[PDB]
């Protein structure tokens, strides 16, 4: 007579978990390097950058969900302190492999067809719903095979599994002091149909591109010993002693 409704996969996986986080600078980028974010960042939307949602979504082989992207923008100041600004941010949704902008004020941000969302810091966080956009009927979470017809393709990375790019910029111009604008993206998968459950991953992750494994140096969660050791098979660790 116990309710089993909390272990539903629609309830199990629909936690709005952190999927992206960049503290990028917000200043005069006339003298900054090429690798640094010049008031914008692209992010290829993947479930794999943070290991807690990843291990939950890697419990299944095939997932059919609607990503409910919630973008939490928060701001800090890089000697003296002044008031935090009410910065307007654009988060333009670019598809996989399409043209992502190269500047803050480039003419790709006009969003003549791309889905953008113009939100502020002092507003509630920008929550959009990105649909099930796989060309297949489910996201191949694990894709045993290769994408390209040649033999140079990446193993495990099906581009149909890839959601897309989330190009996020600050709509405001540069201001005479530098701010550190941290953009946290929270994806809540919903309308979830889950197929083919898998062994939960025990060893720690190495990369987001694959399923490489190293393990800890000692038990628990080591390669030769996943479960932590005890004395003998007839030795009870948490034994009651009275």
């Amino acid at each position: 007579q116990h309710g089993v409704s909390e272990t539903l996969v629609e309830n199990f996986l629909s936690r709005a978990a952190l999927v992206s986080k960049r503290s990028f600078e917000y200043k005069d980028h006339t003298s900054s390097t090429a690798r640094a974010d010049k008031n914008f960042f692209k992010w290829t939307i993947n479930t794999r950058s943070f290991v807690q949602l990843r291990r939950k979504l890697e419990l299944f082989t095939y997932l059919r969900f609607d990503a409910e992207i919630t973008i939490l923008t928060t701001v800090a100041v890089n000697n003296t302190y002044v008031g935090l600004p009410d910065l307007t941010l654009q988060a333009m949704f670019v598809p996989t492999g399409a043209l992502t902008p190269e500047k803050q004020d480039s003419f790709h941000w006009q969003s003549g067809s791309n889905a953008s969302v113009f939100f502020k810091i002092s507003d509630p966080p920008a929550r959009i719903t990105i649909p099930f956009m796989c060309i297949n009927s489910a996201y191949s979470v694990f894709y045993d095979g290769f994408a390209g017809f040649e033999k140079n393709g990446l193993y495990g990375i099906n581009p149909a599994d890839t959601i897309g790019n989330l190009c996020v910029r600050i709509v405001n111009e540069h201001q005479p002091v530098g701010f550190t604008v941290t953009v946290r993206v929270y994806m809540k998968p919903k309308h979830i149909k889950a197929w083919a459950p898998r062994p939960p991953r025990t060893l720690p992750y190495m990369s987001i591109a694959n399923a490489n494994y190293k393990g800890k140096e000692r038990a628990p969660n080591a390669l030769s010993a996943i479960i932590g050791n005890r004395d003998s098979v007839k030795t009870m660790p948490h034994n009651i002693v009275n």
């Binding site: 939950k56 038990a219 010993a225 932590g228 098979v233 007839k234 009870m236 034994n239 009275n242």
Partner: protein, 99 residues
């Protein structure tokens, strides 16, 4: 899903799943005991009943241990699989645990 009852040192890798029982010259000896904390670390952690339950805090319901013997067809013998409800120590002699 398989229990890692042999979670000892010098059990490297796949030796942790199996439990090596042998011909014993003594009488009524202990072979292994299993820490039954589903939520905590132990031989039930890396199981389907254990990895999914560590996503939760409160749990109910019965468990179902299947012990698969992997000796020869000529190997004959008997075991007793005592479940002891808690409160006391882990029972070490057979007369204590068959109760």
């Amino acid at each position: 899903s398989m229990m890692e009852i042999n979670n000892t040192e010098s059990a490297v890798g796949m030796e942790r799943l199996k439990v090596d029982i042998s011909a014993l010259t003594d009488v009524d000896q202990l072979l292994f005991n299993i820490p039954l904390d589903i939520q905590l670390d132990g031989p039930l952690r890396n199981t389907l009943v254990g990895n999914i339950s560590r996503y939760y805090t409160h749990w109910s319901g019965s468990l179902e241990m299947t012990f698969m013997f992997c000796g020869s067809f000529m190997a004959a013998g008997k075991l007793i699989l005592c479940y002891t409800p808690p409160g006391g120590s882990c029972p070490t002699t057979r007369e204590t645990a068959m109760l």
